[PDB]
Symmetry: D2
Amino acid sequence: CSLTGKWTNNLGSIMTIRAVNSRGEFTGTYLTAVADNPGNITLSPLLGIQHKRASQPTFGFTVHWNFSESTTVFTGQCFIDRNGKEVLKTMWLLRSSVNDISYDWKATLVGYNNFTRLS
Amino acid sequence: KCSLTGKWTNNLGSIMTIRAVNSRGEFTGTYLTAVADNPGNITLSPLLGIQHKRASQPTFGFTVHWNFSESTTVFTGQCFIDRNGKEVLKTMWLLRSSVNDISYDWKATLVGYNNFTRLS
Amino acid sequence: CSLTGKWTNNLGSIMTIRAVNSRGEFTGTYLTAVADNPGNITLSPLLGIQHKRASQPTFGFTVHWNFSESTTVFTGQCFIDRNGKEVLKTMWLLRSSVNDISYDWKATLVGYNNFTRLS
Amino acid sequence: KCSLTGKWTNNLGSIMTIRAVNSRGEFTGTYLTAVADNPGNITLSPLLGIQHKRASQPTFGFTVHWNFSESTTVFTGQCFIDRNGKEVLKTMWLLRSSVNDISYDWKATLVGYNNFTRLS
Ligand SMILES: O=C(CCCC[C@@H]1SC[C@@H]2NC(=O)N[C@@H]21)Nc1ccc([N+](=O)[O-])cc1
Ligand SMILES: O=C(CCCC[C@@H]1SC[C@@H]2NC(=O)N[C@@H]21)Nc1ccc([N+](=O)[O-])cc1
Ligand SMILES: O=C(CCCC[C@@H]1SC[C@@H]2NC(=O)N[C@@H]21)Nc1ccc([N+](=O)[O-])cc1
Ligand SMILES: O=C(CCCC[C@@H]1SC[C@@H]2NC(=O)N[C@@H]21)Nc1ccc([N+](=O)[O-])cc1
């Protein structure tokens, strides 16, 4: 269950993840299929850490959107079924930029995503 | 302006130390949690994240790989600067526990908040 | 998109909801397919409110688990597709009972559920 | 023991009033939020929920049907009593916005926290 490779989720987004180093750290690139303003979407870098020893590791990563002031974090676990098929089960928080601390209450969206490997 | 570099404490008493933020907004550091499911096992743990660079009050996210647990936490939030120049990180977090198989996935994710201010 | 009726979700849970009154309030009964201790599962009452005027209303409800000290809240929206098929898209928070306020940080689980009508 | 009956204020300044808790733990009341997406539209709004009855520090949940918005909020939490008998509600919430169709569902749910103490 190395996060290295190419993935798609239930919203149609795709991400590519590079080699996971000995500390479990990885970089990659995220293409979201959806956005507040979808006409603005550009490829956005991600940076995260997975656990290394576990066969079905937990992990987290941050996506710095390159077309928005927002940021998303994803966390989840990679599972392997009896046929060797991998799924990333994740939850996410999406932080929007607000003007000052008095607007903080409305700044964080939550959701889920299930990822599978592209071919 | 708001750079996450430096030492911070939160409302639970945890301490984190963030190193240099690079020109992409990437940063690393360490996180010493005050609380855990098994606090007798707590050890200093690494974090890795990204903040926005241009904004004076940037949003950001980071991941903490706990070195004593199979779990992982992610934090996201915004750094605010008030009229006196005091900085606060307002964050929300998700903590993913390791479960045995996908049938237990539903119970694997905790949610919460944390407010951080600077040590010094 | 009246919540009245019989529903199942992606985890295999089922719920039955009674008549929605003029204020949008409803009661019902929830049978979860999963629990921390599944051998203890019993039917549990729910109580909530939906919006009335909207064709695709938002709503919320609370489930008082009758076999646990925990409580779950669900919120979401009822959608109708081109064929007239309804789906409840929901997110939930599950509050566990902890001993004192110093344990509060670990007391709230989050997740999703998609519900469809039973037949 | 902890009955949600009475008036409470939260960290955002909102006020809610909970009526009698029945023998099932069900309660109704009203919620006056201090903040909204469009605060010029705020009106007093009804809530309905259930708490546990036997526990001295019960968990609970409630739904607020905003009377001025198509959105709905749910809150869940626990009532704690400290060594001096002071009560605090520690809660987390989800706020569901109304979106036009299912393709926008992903952006429809906000999350947050609130801490409540008694008015009086
Ligand atoms: O649009 C944005 C930036 C792109 C976010 C894509 C999200 S990441 C969670 C989910 N999973 C995906 O694969 N893609 C979506 N930011 C944003 C979105 C909504 C709002 N809003 O106010 O609703 C503000 C900023
Ligand atoms: O205990 C752990 C690892 C350490 C988590 C510390 C959390 S990070 C969010 C919050 N903010 C802090 O500063 N500290 C806390 N993992 C864990 C926790 C609970 C459960 N559980 O099942 O409840 C399983 C694993
Ligand atoms: O087990 C319980 C009570 C039953 C909860 C069922 C949940 S409601 C969200 C989800 N959707 C469903 O249809 N069913 C599940 N409470 C509980 C669960 C886990 C923990 N825990 O610590 O992990 C503590 C209490
Ligand atoms: O504004 C609204 C309706 C009022 C919500 C008040 C929230 S309930 C959680 C928090 N605790 C409080 O005491 N008050 C706040 N709905 C709404 C809000 C934001 C958005 N949005 O898109 O950001 C859409 C609808």
